[PDB]
Structures are given as C-alpha cells and as structure tokens.
Write a protein that binds this ligand. Structure first.
Ligand SMILES: O[C@@H]1[C@@H](O)[C@H](O)OC[C@H]1O
Length: 313
C-alpha cells in the first residue's frame, strides 16, 4: 500500500523547518510513501489552498504545520468527509476534527527558558517576548515561562516591564520590539524572555546598540547554528535543543500508520476545543555554555566542522 502524504508547512525561515521537511520526507519515502510538500509563506489563505489542492490530488494523509492554528476547521472538515487522516505537526490545530498531534513538551520548553533566567537574574526587570500570536505553541511557552516566573513576580523580586508577541516569529520584528522596549524603560531591562533563537537574535542586536549585549540575560529555542555561537560568545544565555530527527522520523511513521487505517499509540490526549486529540510529546533539552559539546555536537545536530566552516571566505 503506497500511502500518499501531503505536507503543508508554514514557512522555511526558521533553521529547523528545512530539517523537519528533509527528515520527514526521507523517512516517509523509506516507508514506501509518496510525499508532496508545500509552504504557505506564512499566509493562512495560501495554506488553505495548498491543503485543498492536496485533498483534490487524493492524498491519504495530511501533515500540517499550521501558520495560524485557529482558521483550519473547515479545510479539516473537507479532509475528513473524504476519509483523509490529519496529523498536526509540531503545532496544535484548534477546533478541528484532526486525528493526531505530535510535538515536543512545549510547556516544559517555556519552564526551561524561565528557569535558566531566574538562576542568574533572580531580581530585576523582565521583558516577555513571545512568538507568533497565532501559534498555539507560543501560548504554551508563555504558560511554561509564567509557571516559573509567577512566584518571583508575586514576591516583588521580579517586575514584568513589558510583553509583546512577535509576528511571524521574525527576527526583524523582534529587533524593533526590543528597540522600543529599551526606549520605553530607559534601558532598564535585566532579562529578556525570548521564546526562540531567531527572535533572540533580533533582540540581541537591539541590546547591542545600547551596550547591553552580554549583560542582559536572554533565553531561546531550537539551537540554531547562530544561537549556539551566540551562547559560546556570551551574548545569549541558553537555548532549548529539540532533536528534530526524533520528531520527524516518528511523525513519518505515524503518518504512514494513519494512511493504512491503523491507530497510532499516544502518550496522552490534548483537548483542542473540539475533541481530545491523541498526542505524543517529546523531551526538550536545556542547552547552555557548558553542555554544547554533549548535546548538539555529540548528536551531530551541529558538527564541529559545521561550527567552524567559514561562510564568507
Ligand atoms: O521550534 C519552534 C516551534 O515549536 C514554534 O511553534 O514556532 C517557532 C519555532 O522556533
């Protein structure tokens, strides 16, 4: 049985997404499946059209990384009435009749970011820099972050001096937000709770412009090559490493199982507003100055030859 798989993704701007695409496809093809991948360029109407096109071409399974997780209910109904199975990849699709969800433990990611900051800045002014306002995961990171932060806020040790979501998870948007926040607070910010590496990068540039980079604690996520370099350089505090290989291989297995009418095993269910979605959650890894070698280098996520490769000479 050749399963046909349509993979509908948000974009390829964050370093991880090319690896999610490449590992997923390779494994799906190794499992005998045929895969068609499309990117929305972060446009919800492009994403709907692409999904609808996949449905019309007769895929057995849709695998979707939603740009906006709240506007896909109808297109999921279109899939279901044709007997197509739907896997939400990395980000929950809300209020939709989907069959399965796979991701990391996203609340835990948030906890790790906040904890690494309170360890070194237990008193001060905190700014909360979330991700895309239409990415369910952004809310999960925020929840995790505040689970750690709330006792400190309550006791008066920590003051939250600002919170903004970063549209599209875009470094440019993150730079501007940090620039304004710095202006509004007279550069009186001690820690930045950035929700991923790409946004941390923008923030770091605005912090540098005020002579504050290396002095303000700042969290992250994804262990992008550039993030690892920032961490080693002392300008980024930490990142949260999530082994893409594990997510993508497991997602490909689940997709093929779904395509054959099999029911994949779940760790738990998560309610998306419509139903309790069977779901699997992988373990994220705290990464800093002192465990780069033992995590990303050892796993081959970023080999030392990649870390040392000259890009411009
Ligand atoms: O890995 C992160 C993903 O989980 C989040 O939903 O979007 C931004 C990425 O950095």
């Amino acid at each position: 049985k050749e399963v046909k798989i349509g993979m509908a993704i948000d974009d390829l701007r964050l370093e991880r997404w090319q690896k999610d695409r490449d590992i997923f496809v390779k494994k799906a093809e190794s499992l005998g499946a045929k895969v068609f991948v499309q990117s929305a360029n972060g446009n919800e109407e492009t994403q709907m059209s692409q999904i609808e096109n996949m449905i019309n071409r007769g895929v057995d399974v849709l695998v979707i990384i939603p740009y906006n997780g709240q506007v896909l209910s109808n297109v999921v109904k279109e899939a279901k009435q044709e007997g197509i199975k739907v896997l939400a990849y990395d980000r929950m699709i809300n209020d939709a009749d989907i069959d399965f969800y796979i991701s990391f433990d996203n609340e835990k990611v948030g906890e790790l970011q906040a904890k690494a900051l309170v360890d070194i800045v237990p008193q001060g002014n905190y700014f909360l820099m979330g991700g895309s306002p239409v990415d369910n995961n952004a809310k999960l990171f925020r929840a995790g972050q505040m689970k750690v932060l709330k006792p400190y806020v309550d006791s008066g040790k920590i003051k939250v001096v600002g919170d903004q979501w970063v549209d599209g998870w875009l470094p440019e948007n993150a730079l501007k937000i940090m620039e304004n926040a710095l202006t509004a607070n007279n550069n009186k910010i001690d820690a930045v709770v950035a929700s991923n590496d790409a946004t941390a990068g923008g923030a770091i540039q605005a912090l540098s412009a005020q002579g504050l980079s290396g002095k303000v604690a700042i969290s992250g996520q994804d262990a992008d090559l550039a993030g690892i370099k920032r961490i080693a350089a002392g300008t980024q505090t930490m990142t949260v490493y999530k082994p893409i290989t594990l997510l993508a291989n497991t997602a490909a297995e689940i997709a093929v199982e779904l395509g054959n009418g099999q029911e994949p095993k779940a760790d738990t269910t998560l309610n998306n507003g419509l139903k309790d979605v069977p779901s699997r959650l992988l373990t994220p890894i705290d990464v800093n100055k002192n465990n780069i070698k033992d995590t990303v280098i050892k796993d081959g996520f970023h080999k030392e030859s990649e870390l040392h490769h000259h890009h411009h000479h």
